[PDB]
Symmetry: D2
Subunit: 509 residues, 4 copies
């Protein structure tokens, strides 16, 4: 009855998956904790099982990772880069099948599953070059015969907790960077994407083994809130990268701060698109559609708020309805499907409640609003008009495809309305106005980590630092100098002179 036991899904075995899998890796595979079964959200059929980590598994693994660090930190960064390069190659080799597993277990369409694996491949190739660049300036000291240098060194063990919706790429961003920076990693992924976590870890383990390196450099401990909390409280976890809900991230940030650890928090978003009167509507409508319904509206960067100037509000909404109608719904492995299921049945309940609250708070559902009558967690992509910008439900992050549409008149108020929410991840304006664009990028503009112009809220590449402000948590991943969060700065003064300090009256020697 497991999908992995059906010949139709034999390709799963190309990732080294079996009926029952070990969810702990530290150089050896094991798992003494609870056995979890994960399910395909397109049909709710069981795929396979994973043995999760017990506390003893976690203890053993942290210790092994920290012993492996002693070897790893001694390897020159460029040589660490070479390992990361080989990891990218090993992912390249498995990209289609790993992409298919992401579609199967998580629920996003295949091109996005493959695309997410390509994202990890790309950050590896990036990190290879960065591994030859990381460090700090030699500075001119004000003291004669002294050197002043800024050094960067690994923090040690980087704990990585990731969410269901990007079960490969977020880990990848943290892993490739943390690795070239001389850290070891311990991964705890979302329980409902356990097979994906195991499959990626099998790919990396083989590269470490072929290079005769301890596997615990990239440790895995599958588990849920129990293991996540242990990492948050563990002094041996020097940096904890956490991607997930704002509510959980807040508690993780507190626990880390309590022990003077470091945390990197990538939390929820309430991302807005603003369309000004002068905007190219041929650009706005498709941009809005794909940002809003992409991944069934389950991206951290999903467009959840659409502000449209009064003069064009009715036309844009009309064109958006006409476009939603053409969204192709199906299984996420079905070719040319644009739109798959929500990740859990719970997310469907959150969807419905949201649509109910919207209707009751005075909103009108101009499209969607219903559960589709079919197997799996499918809901109609939804557009809601008529709500006030400060409506309770619109300030809430609901991880479903519901787009709240508002009218505005002036630039200052709608910039304010962008900024008024608790989250601070991504934002976008559509306009041709040179002046407005630079105000939006300036000190009185968007308050978000991602501030886009004529591209929707999901526009982001690995070259820049990725992350948000406010309740989004403040962490950055991937590009620019995000690498610094994974290392510790020292300011080092070196007296190379035979000079003595002033005696100040005192008779020395």
């Amino acid at each position: 009855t497991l999908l992995i036991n059906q010949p139709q899904y034999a390709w799963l075995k190309e990732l080294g998956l079996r009926e029952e899998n070990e969810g702990v890796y530290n150089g050896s595979w094991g798992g003494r904790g609870e056995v979890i079964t994960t399910y395909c959200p397109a049909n709710n059929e069981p795929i396979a099982r994973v043995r999760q980590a017990s506390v003893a598994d976690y203890e053993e693994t942290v210790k092994k990772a920290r012993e492996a660090w002693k070897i790893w930190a001694d390897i020159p960064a460029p040589k660490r880069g070479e390992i990361v390069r080989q990891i990218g190659d090993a992912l390249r080799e498995k990209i289609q099948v790993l992409g298919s597993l992401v579609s199967l277990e998580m629920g996003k369409i295949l091109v996005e599953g493959v695309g997410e694996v390509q994202e990890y491949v790309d950050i590896c190739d990036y990190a290879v070059g960065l591994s030859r660049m990381i460090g700090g300036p030699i500075l001119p000291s004000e003291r004669s015969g002294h050197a002043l240098i800024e050094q960067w060194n690994p923090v040690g063990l980087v704990g990585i907790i990731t969410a269901f919706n990007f079960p490969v790429a977020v880990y990848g961003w943290n892993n490739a960077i943390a690795m070239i920076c001389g850290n070891v990693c311990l991964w705890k992924g979302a329980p409902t994407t356990s097979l994906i976590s195991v499959a990626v870890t099998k790919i990396i383990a083989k590269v470490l083994e072929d290079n005769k390196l301890p596997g615990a450099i990239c440790s895995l401990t599958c588990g849920g809130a129990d293991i996540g909390t242990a990492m948050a409280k563990d002094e041996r976890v020097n940096l904890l990268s956490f991607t997930g809900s704002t509510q959980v991230g807040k508690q993780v940030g507190l626990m880390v701060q309590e022990r003077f650890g470091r945390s990197l928090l990538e939390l929820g978003g309430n991302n807005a698109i603003i369309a000004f009167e002068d905007a190219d509507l041929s650009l706005v409508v498709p941009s809005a559609l794909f940002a809003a319904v992409g991944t069934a509206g389950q991206r951290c960067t999903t467009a959840r708020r659409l502000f449209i100037h009064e003069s064009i509000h009715d036309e844009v909404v009309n064109r958006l309805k006409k476009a939603y109608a053409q969204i192709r719904v199906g299984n996420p492995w079905d070719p040319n499907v644009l739109y798959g299921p929500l990740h859990t049945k719970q997310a469907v309940s959150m969807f419905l409640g949201a649509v109910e609250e919207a209707k009751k708070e005075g909103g009108t559902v101009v499209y969607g609003g219903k559960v589709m009558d079919r197997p799996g967690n499918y809901v109609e992509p939804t557009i809601v008009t008529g709500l006030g910008h400060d409506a309770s439900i619109a300030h809430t992050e609901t991880f479903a495809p519901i787009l709240y549409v508002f009218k505005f008149k002036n630039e200052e108020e709608v910039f304010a309305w962008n900024n008024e929410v608790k989250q601070g991840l991504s934002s976008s304006i559509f306009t041709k106005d040179l002046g407005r664009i630079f105000r939006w990028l300036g000190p009185k503009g968007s308050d978000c980590g991602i501030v886009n112009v004529n591209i929707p809220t999901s526009g982001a590449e690995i070259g820049g630092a990725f992350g948000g402000e406010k309740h989004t948590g403040g962490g950055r991943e991937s590009g620019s100098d995000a690498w610094k969060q994974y290392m510790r700065r020292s300011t080092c003064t070196i007296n190379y002179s035979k000079d003595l300090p002033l005696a100040q009256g005192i008779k020395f020697q």
Copy 2:
């Protein structure tokens, strides 16, 4: 009976101080909170009085500061740099009397009082150039017809809480950097250095007023824990910079994390000096003495642990004892004086407490240990031998001139002993060995924020970032790219092309 009403202390009037002073500035001067009297640690005499901030004062001031930010943030960074240049000049003009005030109210010797003002002056001149440099890279987008830019913008209001021991320079580091970065500031200094806070604020207010700027850009609200806690919990304080005890700092960090604010923590030190067998003893002995007894052992970077290789241990300890007896003690403002009083009577009590605690834990006092029989809070600079490196009183930070001396044999164990404590601020080795130096600076070396060679634990200049790791709190001030902590990063993608996105099968337009 107030020192400011005696002719010998008439110079205080040059700083704009009188018998009773307003301790709130927000464009106007005020203060409706409790009136505090500050005392000269050299003779335990009252100097003058300061009216502190009430809750209402605090509320009004935060509001005015945030209103002034609307103006200040619109002022181009280099023009903001020009104001900071003028603050530097106003400081130059008062450097002698302000330096004297620092000696009088805080109790450090006059050249360090003056030296501290010079520090503020120096960061001003530095920030001037920086104000034409702050920003991020334009990066190459992977997308045709798109630009990708990293922007930096002010966070808004920077709350600055400072300690008694550096009552001018810490605020200055924060102030000059936060100012050129486009933020307004709110200062709450240590209550026992209130006159210093008022005097500095009077200098800055005159520059702001003279430039027709709202004075609230550099606001002051004198108070103790109640105002500090208010700032820690205040969502309107976008970044809180805190310098003070690890115990208080931990609670401030938690309160700020609870509200997803930003904190910059500069906390305790337990700094070690390590002398290897090949060290230049003629460099070691004076370096150790000055970093141990400087400012009566009340610097954050004070040398409190001294590791000496066993072959040279007794010779270093004997020479240090002979050097300690030549320390010139007296009034801080008196010339040739090297050693003044502790800041408070409580500090003296802590001093005695620690000395008895060390004897109880098996320590031997080889010099000092007692209170001096004279006016003021004077205690003997103290040397203790025989403790184990992991003695509890050795791991505890006592803000008193006590130096714990330990033997070691080999490099790996003593690097580990440097790193074994909860604090992570400063560290120094004295050695000639080229290999040892680069291992000290490396991943298996010192874990401190400041890592020095052949210069003691107070070695640090403007050009580098200043701060520590672990329970020191992780913040950085002054140099390198510490400015980034006072600003928010946005990653901005601009589509300037007429290219429409892929329709993906949908019929738009």
Copy 3:
């Protein structure tokens, strides 16, 4: 007869100038060369005399500067910055009288003379901060137990040759940066702004001498081509910064290259403004006027070519003509004056030559074209229409206020026309079109070193690197990392390990 002997010009004495002045400084003042008398171009009267350098003067000065470098290079960069800070303040205290001398002897209006001194003051304050920042990265070596560092050190003697039209700021830019970079300097200014060179050097010399530093750190050797040629041919001149004509710059560059020296060339411009059909005309017209007639069209960055879309050509021309007629002409120290004399009588004749050449090539003078009926070197600001964009006189740099106006139809051809000339200094477009703007800034856009949008060709501040491409010479001054041209990069590997190389079958030791 000499202006300096007339009571109305007694203010010249405040700069330390007399009837006959020493034009050589190297710690001592002297000059055994040709005596030159400089003239006011506003009334063609002699101002005062300068004794120029003989060959023996130049020889002695080079040797003294290079001796002085031994001391100067040993001063830590931040302390070099303090000298430059003090130079900044010394210029501040003399800014009005110095700016007045620039107006007197060179002929630009008072606000530009004063402004040029402010420019030197500003780069000083910039350089002070930079002096704590210059240097390179510490990079991660691929070899275990090795450090890899990029060091920067002074080149030695920086020869600086400057032009008549910016007799203070160009030197100032080079001086401030070279100085904090640990170089010594040798200045040869234009013979016709000799008093300005002597006055600037008197101010710097006092600062150096007051700091008990050898004056030859900032040497002056006034002279013409013979002194300049000697600098170009002199191996002891490690870097030669040349600002002047393309014709001479080419020969200077070749001579320096012949001896494998370093050159920094800032040569001519043929700068264009392009106004597209969507441009804000109320921005275009005054931008063009002030960029065309400012400094009587004698800036390297002066707008000489004006391209206007066919649809708005006649209107912009008519509005420019109406605006030129209101330009106020007079003595450059009169504050109502926007417009001063040309620098020489030869320049007036060449103005006439170009006008006549333009008419010969088929052009129409729509405004001006004539010498003005008054004492001094005054000509009418001039507009020429109807020339082809590849007319010879339009591709010629004439240092006179003649603006050549062209029609254009489309973007691609007008970008090509901007780029078609030999020079490559500055360029500007006026447009609202987002896409056009980023194409202009991109690879198929302007080929100049300064590339502006909605601001004319004279738009430049100290924060960025200043200079051009192609026949403008390639050098950069002032901002960004222009400082690297004044220093030598070394890539340094330090083996600090006890490891021995592989024996490769050879029995060593």
Copy 4:
């Protein structure tokens, strides 16, 4: 008769080489110039033939390359990065056979031939990441409502002239960087390594064609001085990267400067090793040996001068002699061989002239000095004692394994003797003294581009910039910000405000 026609050398066909090969590539293969035969330096047998470029081939190729640029410059840098990544992979696939060709045609031993290919592979991988990093800062304008940005854009066509001794890696450094920076390339390699140039170009040509890119993006024009001179004089060659003799390079520099082009010169070396009294002699002797005789003394970074403190001089020379005696001499592809032939018979003749000149100037040959009686261009590795540091022959670069040895006593004189030569490429000291090491690295130390400590003169990796000063030419290749030499800087001010300029008394509109 041709080696390529022998079955033992059948592997050469794996590089797609045949009896007669086309030596021009621009998307098409051709060559109407003279047919050159290249010879194995180890036995002087002909290998195969290459048809070189006529003038017509060159002209057409430059035009096709510049056409190709219009497409290439429009490709986003990260995507150009992806092409370079694939080039690295294609090189990987042929690393053994390509390396074997390098040993065969050029004559360096196998591990270095393969090593050279690996070098190109590594810079490709580095360039991949850099292609998402290149660009400049956004800077804070002093002007309200203005943006100030530094842009970097390709120069266009980069001509690359390379030398015999590194027939793969030097081109690869230039190629990988130039390509990600958006330039197209035109390669003219040394005529005596033509088969190598063709073999490399075949590999790249396939990658471009598989990606449907025009092949002229990486163009090849095989030829001698006539094609090189043409490139130096050609205004269409925007940057000329020249690697080769100081003699030729001087003329290339002058030709490029004459037309105001850009040049990047990598010229001769006269590299010193300096052994101080405290040096690790087990470290010094093999470091000296391998750096002196490596690649038969034919590296630009080859150690040619050895300075030894008088106290250890005879000991090191004796130990060096005994080690030279054990150098294994033979065919460069032979696995056990350390030492192969010089590249040409002319090189053997120059070697002989240098040895005879060293004797006539009073040197003593204490090891080697003779041509070896065997097939090929073999000479004995040679050591010469007794010359003064300023002997003419020692100041001369003879591209042969001749090591000039000198005594010295003190640091100051020996730093000067390192610096006194015209060349400025690489330098090394061996010492343990901390003070000496940082002095060496400072302003009074080595004047070379590579400045090493306890590692020989050939110590360099791709992470840092590679090149030298003085007569070595000034150019840098590979790491750090060397990429900037392949691009043009623009400083761009964007006025996005509605603000009009001040009227200054003029009535507009």
